Amino acid sequence: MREIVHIQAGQCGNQIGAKFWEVISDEHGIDPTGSYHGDSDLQLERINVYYNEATGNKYVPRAILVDLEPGTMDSVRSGPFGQIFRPDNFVFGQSGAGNNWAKGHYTEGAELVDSVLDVVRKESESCDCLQGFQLTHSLGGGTGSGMGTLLISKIREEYPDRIMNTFSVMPSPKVSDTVVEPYNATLSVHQLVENTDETYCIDNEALYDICFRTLKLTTPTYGDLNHLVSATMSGVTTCLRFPGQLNADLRKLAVNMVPFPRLHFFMPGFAPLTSRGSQQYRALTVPELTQQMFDSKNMMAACDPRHGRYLTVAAIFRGRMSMKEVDEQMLNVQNKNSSYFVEWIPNNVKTAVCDIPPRGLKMSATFIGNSTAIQELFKRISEQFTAMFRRKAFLHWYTGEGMDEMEFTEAESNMNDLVSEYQQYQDAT
Amino acid sequence: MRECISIHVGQAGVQIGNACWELYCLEHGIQPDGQMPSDKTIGGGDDSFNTFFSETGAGKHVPRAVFVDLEPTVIDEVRTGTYRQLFHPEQLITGKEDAANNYARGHYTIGKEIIDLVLDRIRKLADQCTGLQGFLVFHSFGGGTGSGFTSLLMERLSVDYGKKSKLEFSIYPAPQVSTAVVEPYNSILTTHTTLEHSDCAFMVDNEAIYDICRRNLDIERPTYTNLNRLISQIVSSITASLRFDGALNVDLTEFQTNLVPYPRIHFPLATYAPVISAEKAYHEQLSVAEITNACFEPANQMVKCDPRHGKYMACCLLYRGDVVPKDVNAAIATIKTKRSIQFVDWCPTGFKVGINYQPPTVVPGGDLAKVQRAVCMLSNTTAIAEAWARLDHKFDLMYAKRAFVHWYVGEGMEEGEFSEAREDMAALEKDYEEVGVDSVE
Amino acid sequence: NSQVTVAVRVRPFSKREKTEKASQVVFTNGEEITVEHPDMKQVYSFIYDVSFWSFDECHPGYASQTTVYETLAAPLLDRAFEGYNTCLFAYGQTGSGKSYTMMGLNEEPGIIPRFCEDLFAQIAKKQTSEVSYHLEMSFFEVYNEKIHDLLVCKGENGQRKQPLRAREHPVSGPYVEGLSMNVVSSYSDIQSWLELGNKQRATAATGMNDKSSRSHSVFTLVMTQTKTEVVEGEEHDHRITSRINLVDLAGSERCSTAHSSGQRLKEGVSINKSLLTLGKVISALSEQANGKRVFIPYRESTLTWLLKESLGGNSKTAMIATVSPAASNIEETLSTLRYATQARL
Ligand SMILES: CC(=O)O[C@H]1C(=O)[C@@]2(C)[C@H]([C@H](OC(=O)c3ccccc3)[C@]3(O)C[C@H](OC(=O)[C@H](O)[C@@H](NC(=O)c4ccccc4)c4ccccc4)C(C)=C1C3(C)C)[C@]1(OC(C)=O)CO[C@@H]1C[C@@H]2O
Ligand SMILES: Nc1nc2c(ncn2[C@@H]2O[C@H](COP(=O)(O)OP(=O)(O)OP(=O)(O)O)[C@@H](O)[C@H]2O)c(=O)[nH]1
Ligand SMILES: Nc1nc2c(ncn2[C@@H]2O[C@H](COP(=O)(O)OP(=O)(O)O)[C@@H](O)[C@H]2O)c(=O)[nH]1
Ligand SMILES: [Mg+2]
């Protein structure tokens, strides 16, 4: 059966994957020991998509946690679902990157890529058939960007027929949790565009505004944003694990949501998102979910979709529903809002409906979109970059580790050309 | 004897076949364990009719069918559901990975080394059949399995067996509604290969059945397990003369001889009598005239194409239940008297007639109502060119930029294989525009 | 930009093809090049900017080798002489007439040798002691979007062909890291280099025939001009460079009649993708010449990437297709002509 290998690069990768396994176990009925404690016989039929079996009816996940400087690894082992992971898969070296793309692609990444890829082969060759891989990292910073991109390159050199699906946290417009963000983001995009099939551009400000406006939360920590991102992660790969009326997968979404290979940067979203009081004052139905989905305040990309046209979008539904209502609503969205849709694609939407919803809901939807508003996530990066590169601001730390300015100009040149390919379809034709 | 193999391909065909067999088992008397206490209580008769069901010595009845999807998430419902104990355990999944909506993987990358099993089971299920023959492929234009695997299987069965009546009850893409952004390519790519080998392919569209189901059956929130049952009723009205006794029978080659004037124009439309709900079954007569006048009503057509922009090359009317021929003849005459139903001058006859006695069954927990008569129309008209003129336009928009094409060339396929498959469909449209013109002496 | 010049050529019947008496499917009426199936059904028409007929030595407009040079390749030297770059792409399957067209026979020269010899003639004619001329040669190949060198003599071991990589200079443009470059003064040198290059090129013995091609070859000349003598100190100030790129592509080979599996299938995908993107680029540039607003996908492949300063800008580009007139090769002829038409529009 189809299978995924997850990798966790960077603090964020490891701060999100924990919450993702906490959600998969909740759906599949596994405890910290690995033991099955479910209720239905439909949680174990396709458990192989994420987990491997063990001796005493225990289940071990296929995680490979690579992080230079073992500080963030130690936090997992002293956590709820830390003692289910394989200790042989925790691969970490000391002297962390230091938010340097050079110290996580060239020196220490090169030290620690062989030990990572060994476990990759160990886990992959023990799969019946393999579909693709999965990685969670944060651009702008160090480890997660550089080491992640290095692993992606090595793997797509080894296994190119298979999917590499990165779920990447991106920089924000106003907040700057890290000062060398544009440079690392530029280099990471230059390495991801050529070596990726579909990546998802999560952004933190959008998640904060989702947590404050819709959820009406007052003290939203990181576990809540990771909760939203895990939600989406789980929903994408549902139709491999559970059955339904119109089954989807990663490769159908890839063949459909990607008209040209370089435009594989999407905006995600999750839907039923309500407050603890406003769930008695609505009605879960397909139209309410679609309205929550196409709204600009449930997308995670920090990019208002109304500043550009949708090239393609996808809705993965979960629950007992009616395909008539689904298609009628997705057609009304096209016929009303045609100015936000592209004309050389007659139907810009697809659908996917599973039959098994989450542990405590009747309906659920995830939303994905390839748009042209994503310009304003990279144009800014190409403006922060050149304001810093024109004066050689944060540079000597990177030249000092066996690098050159040519690579940086190249990466800038590649991001700008991406922005041009996007702008080509933002005026009506 | 007489026999008909039923092949299902993809997730459209499986979910349809499940409904079809839920209907067939209840019509004949079989229960999901294969056994038949009806015979043990009655003590005779071929009611376990040998067209669809092979019979062992232990009283079981195992049906003549295969079904493939290249992904086990679908058929593993059958290996777990109610019909576990009925169907042969050879349900040839080889679904290590799906066809991802491309003809490219359904035709060559994940097609080769798997079709051999299908052809082997077909050889094993044909040599057990010393009778009339003909195969029924159930697939959907638009998938990677409904397109390429179908085009691969028919081009091989046209070598292995040859002069046999092959048929295809295929799902058709709706104009506006569609659940994929690639069906315009798969549709015409499949039509290129399945226009020379096949003999008569009946087409059905989801939007038509959806629009029917609220207007008549009063369902505003329908699903896929309430259109697949109507599809099974159509298949049963098509395949009933093989099984049940009747006043005027029509077999498999006859649909192929009446409704296919030229080799290439073998793509008609279908209808039934769904003005019939549980409450509206009363308040209504359901005569032969009233039901047959639902033929020419575009509101009851099962493919989105108004026939009043075209003419009828041929038509076939299969009647079930309590029907008397003069009622059918009055219906046909009342139809011909009208001027909204145009007919090609090279066909003044126009119609077939086929009558059988066994009425349709009610799949319990269902929407349709008990009837004393049912009707099916199979109509070859020149209107469906319009229903293709949209598809060949969509192609011509997204093939201008060469969009969604690198995924197909990535799984072994030429970029000049779409220009060669789009230059044949325009010829077919031109053929329809040619035959529909009346001759000037 | 300037008008990409597409051209065709219909080779004559071969010796065996005339002995076995194969039929004729492709006809011409001046500019029109139509294709009549023997007995099936409708005829497909095709129209191009230039058309060459080489079926028999009677017809008006028999385009021999000299006419092919003098109508397509000759003015490209002129623009290659005024400092502007130029590219000529060949396209066609095996058994269609590329090697007879581009290189040719020792008694019937192709386009490459006439190019080089007319070059050297115009060089030595103008070679005063105030205006010099330097030439620089190179030869490489794309195999599964990996750039390999061919002048490099290899050792007898396992995988020795080192894959070089591309890089973008902010001023010059895209280029190759480690592609050797050699000086040339006599075409004998170019021949002794090109034979050595072709002997190393990737060419698998496909089930149809042994001699084929599974890699895209590029043959680059650089023409450097030292026209500079200032009247104040007699010292060289400026220096023009022009790039000439003669490219030999590979065939479609749809994996359908040729059940391929393994390394002979990945090559297919690479070739088809490169041809799908190059046609896209040439179409977008043809639209760019027509005063519209278009984006040229240059980074979706390698050849489109390295040849980016030669195609666009104030350049001039050329393409030659080769088609067989027999009836057994109708699918390949159609696949080539349709491709060429897409390049045109
Ligand atoms: C009956 C009912 O309405 O209770 C809900 C509830 O009130 C709300 C507030 C829940 C609640 O969600 C949150 O509180 C929340 C807070 C911050 C950030 C994100 C979520 C709920 O906690 C969440 C919880 O939903 C789940 O448990 C899902 O399975 C969820 N998984 C987990 O929550 C989880 C469990 C263990 C460990 C880690 C995560 C899930 C989400 C997506 C995909 C798969 C599973 C449920 C029913 C509720 C509460 C409990 C209040 C909602 O949960 C979601 C996203 O499904 C938010 O929208 C739904 C419905 C309601 O608004
Ligand atoms: N009427 C009807 N149509 C269906 C049903 N299931 C799927 N379809 C249609 O068929 C198309 C789905 O493509 P499929 O042919 O199922 O794809 P597939 O055959 O599963 O093969 P893949 O494309 O590889 O998944 C959609 O356009 C649906 O409208 C069904 O139960 N009934
Ligand atoms: N969502 C989320 N983001 C985080 C978390 N921790 C760090 N980040 C993000 O990661 C970025 C910093 O990169 P970081 O992972 O620390 O660099 P690294 O240590 O080299 O991998 C910042 O932009 C943060 O927004 C977390 O727990 N949750
Ligand atoms: Mg499927």
Author numbering:
A (entry chain B): 1 to 429
B (entry chain A): 1 to 441
C (entry chain K): 391 to 735
Q: Anything the authors wrote about it?
A:
Construct K735 comprises the core motor domain and no neck-linker residues. To investigate this issue, we obtained the cryo-EM structures of microtubules in complex with the constructs K735 and K743 that have truncated neck-linkers. In the Apo and ADP states the motor domain structures are very similar for all the complexes investigated; this is regardless of whether the KIF14 construct contained a truncated or a full neck-linker, they all conform to the open configuration. All the microtubule-bound KIF14 open structures have the more twisted β-sheet conformation, regardless of the nucleotide species in the active site.
KIF14 is a microtubule-based motor protein with essential roles during cell division. KIF14 belongs to the kinesin-3 family of motor proteins. As all kinesins, KIF14 possesses a highly conserved catalytic motor or head domain that contains nucleotide and microtubule binding sites, and where ATP hydrolysis is coupled to the generation of mechanical work. Here we report the near-atomic resolution structures of twenty KIF14-microtubule complexes corresponding to five distinct KIF14 constructs in four nucleotide conditions mimicking four key steps of the ATP hydrolysis cycle.
